[PDB]
Amino acid sequence: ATVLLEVPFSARGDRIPDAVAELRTREPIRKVRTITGAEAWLVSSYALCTQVLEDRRFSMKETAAAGAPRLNALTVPPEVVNNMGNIADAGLRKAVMKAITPKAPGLEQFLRDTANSLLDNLITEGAPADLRNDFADPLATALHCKVLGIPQEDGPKLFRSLSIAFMSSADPIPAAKINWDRDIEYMAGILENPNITTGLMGELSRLRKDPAYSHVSDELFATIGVTFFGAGVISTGSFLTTALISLIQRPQLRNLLHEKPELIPAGVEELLRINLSFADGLPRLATADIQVGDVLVRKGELVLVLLEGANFDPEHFPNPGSIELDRPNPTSHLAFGRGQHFCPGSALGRRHAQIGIEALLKKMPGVDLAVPIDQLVWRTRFQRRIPERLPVLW
């Protein structure tokens, strides 16, 4: 006897397992067991993934209900899974969205200046350099301090919560509550701090004292700061790190982007499409009985939308494992989701990766891995796939 197929399949972010294409062809929705022991429906074709993400009867918020089959344990309060919903209900969606666009005056120059300073410090120190810990993550942390309006020197301590906050664990994590409560107290202090007048926290601090928002809770305001810092920093640092691996492993493309930097936006869109940074399918709970392909998903069951299942589907992206800069459907991948919950940080995430890549290719045009690829250590039981260190020379 064999056991029910377990997810996730591999924590490696540098290769897609051959199993995914076999599942997609044979059984694009099928039962799997998650790390909690729950059953779920794993959805792996582009057609069926888009169906589930575009049907709100597959609910994000209901994944937090007591008693439901779980992908992993909550690392935040259950009402917090619903954070964007709550932002919208408080009338704060347009203001949050405006504050996190990469369009603010000087923001792109700040990203460039910060990427160049981090790269000059690595060049001074000499090879090997670690492009995750000493490049992509500090660039993500400095960008999000600037976008929030909070001091750059507060970025490292907020960042240190993330290796626990974004765990994908079978059981509750006592350190995640200690760090969440601390980080909420920090963001509540920021809303009372008269020096914080710019970015997303300066805007929320003003709206807090405006009569049109006098009954929005102080818990929501602090929560938006902790959730957007952590989600933005983990998502952009982890995607930049694993896109740098895919670029370094393609020297022909690396040289083409170095020679024609105007192609970096189209290269970043293909690196988003092939990115394996999400370690688990996106979870949803059925709120009704709904036909998905050959399966009737029933009310209360867990569905997992496998982003690389959709993004490597050759029926939608022919020659899916190849980076092609002239596809006719280049932004139609699911790297930022789809539907009601499509990432509000999409533009910021694209600009962070374009600027970090442009700066790296100008400063270190000979960048290459300093260890054999199989020597990267892939973090396990985490919501992202990331190498613990990314050693390069140039």
- In the structure encoding, which two tokens stand for residue 26, read together? 């044979």
Query: Known binder of ligand: residue 343?
Result: yes
Region of residue 273 (left: phi > 0; alpha: psi -120 to 50; beta: else): alpha
Give whichever of 163 and 393 is closer to ligand HEM, judged by the CB atom.
163
Query: Known binder of ligand: residue 157?
Result: no
Question: In sequence order, what DSSP letters do the residues of 191-213 get, joined into one string?
Answer: HH-TT--SHHHHHHHHHHTSGGG
Interaction mask 94-133, ligand MQN, x per CB under 6 A: ----------------------------------------
Handedness of CA 192, 196, 197, 198 (dihedral sign): negative
Q: Which of residues 204-243 bind ligand HEM (CB under 6 A)?
A: 227-228, 231-232, 235-236, 239
Query: Known binder of ligand: residue 83?
Result: yes
Q: From CA 185, how far away is CA 226, in angstroms rounded?
A: 10
Q: Which does 81 bind (CB under 5 to 8 A by kind): ligand MQN, ligand HEM, none?
A: ligand MQN
Beta-carbon contacts of residue 285 (< 8 Å; ≥ 6 apart): 58, 59, 62, 63, 65, 68, 300, 301, 302, 303
Query: Known binder of ligand: residue 242?
Result: no
Interaction mask 334-363, ligand HEM, x per CB under 6 A: -xxx---x-xxx--xx--------------
From candidates 72, 86, 223, 235, binder to ligand MQN by CB under 6 A: 235
Measured N-to-C along each axis, helices 264-273 and 251-259 cross at an angle, to the nearest 10 degrees, of 150
Give the interface segment with ligand HEM, choosing from 43-51, 332-340, 376-384, 385-393 (CB under 6 A): 332-340
From candidates 40, 81, 303, 353, binder to ligand MQN by CB under 6 A: 81
- CB atoms under 10 Å from CB of 77, counted, come to 15
The answer to whether residues 154 and 182 touch, using CB atoms and an 8 Å cutoff, is: no
- In the structure encoding, which two tokens stand for residue 340, read together? 């009601």
Least Å from the CB of residue 231 to ligand MQN: 4
Query: By CB under 6 A, is residue 60 in contact with ligand HEM?
Result: yes
From candidates 300, 330, 339, 391, binder to ligand MQN by CB under 6 A: 300
Q: Using the 8-state DSSP alphabet, how is residue 153 labeled?
A: G
Query: Known binder of ligand: residue 340?
Result: no
| Helix (H) / strand (E) containing 147 | helix 137-148
| Residue at shortest CB range from ligand HEM | 345
Interaction mask 51-70, ligand MQN, x per CB under 6 A: ---------x----------
Query: Known binder of ligand: residue 75?
Result: yes
Least Å from the CB of residue 92 to ligand HEM: 12
In order of 9, 186, 198, the CA distances from 226 in angstroms are 30, 9, 16
Shortest CA distance to 221 belongs to which of 99, 356, 379? 99
Least Å from the CB of residue 368 to ligand MQN: 30
Beta-carbon contacts of residue 348 (< 8 Å; ≥ 6 apart): 100, 101, 102, 143, 147, 232, 236
Q: Which does 100 bind (CB under 5 to 8 A by kind): ligand HEM, ligand MQN, none?
A: ligand HEM
Backbone angles phi, psi at 391, to 5 degrees: -80, 125
Give whichever of 257 and 276 is closer to ligand HEM, judged by the CB atom.
276
Q: From CA 139, how far away is CA 118, in angstroms rounded?
A: 8
Give whichever of 15 and 299 is closer to ligand MQN, judged by the CB atom.
299
Q: Count the site residues for ligand HEM by CB under 6 A.
A: 20
Least Å from the CB of residue 100 to ligand HEM: 5
Q: Which residues contact ligand MQN by CB under 6 A? A: 60, 81, 231, 235, 298-300, 343
Q: Which residues contact ligand HEM by CB under 6 A? A: 60, 84, 100, 227-228, 231-232, 235-236, 239, 282, 335-337, 341, 343-345, 348-349
Q: Mark the binding-site residues for heme, compressed into ranges.
A: 284, 341, 343
